[PDB]
A paper describes a structure:
The structure of IPI is a variant of the all-beta, immunoglobulin (Ig) fold. It is possible that IPI is important for protein-protein interactions, of which inhibition of Isp1 is one. IPI homologues are found in both bacteria and archaea, but no homologues have been detected in eukaryotes.
Bacillus subtilis was determined to 2.6 Å resolution by the MAD method. Remarkably, we find that the region at the edge of the IPI wedge structure could interact with subtilisin in a manner strongly reminiscent of inhibition modes of other subtilisin family inhibitors. This implies that IPI is not closely related to the I42 family, and that the similar folds may have been acquired independently by convergent evolution. However, the tertiary structure and docking predictions illustrate how it could feasibly inhibit its cognate enzyme.
Numbering used by the authors: 3 to 119
């Protein structure tokens, strides 16, 4: 029913937490996304008081380059990130937002609860 779908998988590792994402074109048509900088996504890890614990974007510099990307019918754009410190046990939420903009598409974002144990 939705043309594009973003999935998030959060996996607790020994030294860190890993986030695997896949932006999937489920439509029958190719879809173009445009970006105004090199940055492809944003990822933010919220705690139970909605304070930010991690932001992919902090500590990074992106080129001010326009980009033009086509996701074919069925194609996925796969991407991941590592949060380099396990926090304390509890439930958290990761919100990934895709920075590419498709004509006649709401911006693509997903959220995902995950427990650190």
């Amino acid at each position: 029913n939705q043309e594009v779908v973003l999935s998030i998988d959060a996996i607790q590792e020994p030294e860190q937490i890993k986030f695997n994402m896949s932006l999937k074109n489920q439509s029958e048509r190719a879809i173009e996304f445009q970006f105004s900088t090199g940055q492809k996504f944003e990822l933010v890890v919220y705690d139970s008081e909605h304070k930010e614990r991690y932001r992919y974007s902090k500590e990074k510099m992106f080129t001010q380059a326009f980009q033009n990307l086509t996701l074919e019918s069925g194609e996925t754009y796969d991407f991941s990130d590592v949060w380099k410190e396990v926090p304390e046990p509890g439930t958290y939420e990761v919100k990934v937002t895709f920075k590419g903009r498709a004509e006649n598409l709401k911006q693509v974002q997903a959220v995902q609860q995950f427990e650190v144990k």
